[PDB]
Amino acid sequence: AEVTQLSNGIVVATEHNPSAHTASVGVVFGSGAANENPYNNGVSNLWKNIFLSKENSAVAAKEGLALSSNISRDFQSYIVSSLPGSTDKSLDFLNQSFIQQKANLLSSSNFEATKKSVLKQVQDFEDNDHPNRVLEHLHSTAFQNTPLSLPTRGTLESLENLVVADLESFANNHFLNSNAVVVGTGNIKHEDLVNSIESKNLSLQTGTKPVLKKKAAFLGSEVRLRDDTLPKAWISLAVEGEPVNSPNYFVAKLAAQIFGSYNAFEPASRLQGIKLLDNIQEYQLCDNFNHFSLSYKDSGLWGFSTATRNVTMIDDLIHFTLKQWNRLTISVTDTEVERAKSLLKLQLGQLYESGNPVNDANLLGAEVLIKGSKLSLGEAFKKIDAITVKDVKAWAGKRLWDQDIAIAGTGQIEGLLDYMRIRSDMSMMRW
Amino acid sequence: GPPSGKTYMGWWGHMGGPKQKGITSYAVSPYAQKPLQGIFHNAVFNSFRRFKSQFLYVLIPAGIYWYWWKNGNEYNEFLYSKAGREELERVNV
Ligand SMILES: CCCCCCCCCCCO[C@@H]1O[C@H](CO)[C@@H](O[C@H]2O[C@H](CO)[C@@H](O)[C@H](O)[C@H]2O)[C@H](O)[C@H]1O
The missing domain is CATH 3.30.830.10 (Metalloenzyme, LuxS/M16 peptidase-like)
Incomplete structure (x- = not known):
């Protein structure tokens, strides 16, 4: 009724909504396109798409879950949506994707197929989305040679030069507990989420x-x-x-x-x-x-x-x-x-x-x-x-x-x- | 307004040039630039452009005419001096 905020190592934040018929659990990182450089520009956008890759989505769908991810300038998110009861199943998937899995989603066939997908995606945006393409260029010239100048989708030049290693480097440097917040919205209680999180252990790059x-x-x-x-x-x-x-x-x-x-x-x-x-x-x-x-x-x-x-x-x-x-x-x-x-x-x-x-x-x-x-x-x-x-x-x-x-x-x-x-x-x- | 004759220049939005595509231009505000604190010294090696590259086209014709003038002037002075009296009568009459 006032949005709770608890920390035990991992900062958990929820916003209970009684009128909601669904629930969303995910992790938001305090790093976005503004934390990339002109040469790895698009790495976050590539991560979003491998997370939304068919293999990862099929697994989630079997469990009755829907995946969502947004790449912004200052932040980056990865959310899983489900019924209010299947809230624990979301955490398992979330836990799996960012703790268990690694070489599964970053396989040669998945990465290349995903890379090819975002490449055609960005090409279409630069070729057809005029109002947004112009707004992206406004940021580019206004903040030139500064973090805020990089487009969130990345550039074709840097995108075609990206390799699995670049993704890993970014992940190791930004997907950290100190740069993250696990969120809970829709129809879910704070205690239900905090205890389910506090249920597991490990740290995966602590203090970093x-x-x-x-x-x-x-x-x-x-x-x-x-x-x-x-x-x-x-x-x-x-x-x-x-x-x-x-x-x-x-x-x-x-x-x-x-x-x-x-x-x-x-x-x-x-x-x-x-x-x-x-x-x-x-x-x-x-x-x-x-x-x-x-x-x-x-x-x-x-x-x-x-x-x-x-x-x-x-x-x-x-x-x-x-x-x-x-x-x-x-x-x-x-x-x-x-x-x-x-x-x-x-x-x-x-x-x-x-x-x-x-x-x-x-x-x-x-x-x-x-x-x-x-x-x-x-x-x-x-x-x-x-x-x-x-x-x-x-x-x-x-x-x-x-x-x-x-x-x-x-x-x-x-x-x-x-x-x-x-x-x-x-x-x-x-x- | 009355129908007017076609020319080779239009106005903003329809200047009459070819369709432009693929060219991107960038500029920076004059307010964000160095207050013209580099007039001399920085623009001395670029200077003399209208000199080194253009001086001969100006100099040769100028030299030709100046020497043609000096030659004729010295001769006129000679003709009207005591020593030039005989030649004056020859070329004048
Ligand atoms: C025919 C011979 C007669 C010559 C007479 C000379 C005329 C002098 C006019 C001088 C000043 O006229 C004055 O110009 C300045 C800009 O330089 C104007 O300033 C205006 O634009 C400037 C610049 O963006 C802003 O900083 C300012 O807040 C704004 O008011 C000001 O409002 C106007 O009052």
């Missing part, structure tokens, strides 16, 4: 701490992947944002909610209380846009992504959007701040109070790894309601006004002006 490196840094820059054969222009643009556990974490998320998301083809989306919408609908400057406040351990990105077929008016799209951002520093109104509060609460509620145990597992593990605990919506909502117009203006004057930007784009971006023209729009002339 993960590798350390240099911190993430934001660099005003841009990467342009022009492709005149594509039907649209896809653009992502952002300034240095807030890291997780930043004092302005919510103020930044609220600022992003002010401008929000938009889908020109959805009737209700066109009626939102967003001033930018009055400027962009007259000549239909875009098909959609979405503002974000991405937060990581060392840094973050605040900005937006947009897609448009109006290739001759991209300059107006960017101009109007950045002119609106200017407003956060000098003229954002009370009702805009109040509307943002309500919608932010709804966003967080939908994110944290989702009816999915695997989602809760990922969120719970990631947070307890970073701050040792998980913040409740009750506390989050209180912080949000305390945000004032002066807080937004103070934050904007620091993060937005006359600040460097990172830009990424693909498709028909001839109309996207030079860096300086876009950068100049981060402020307004004053007397």
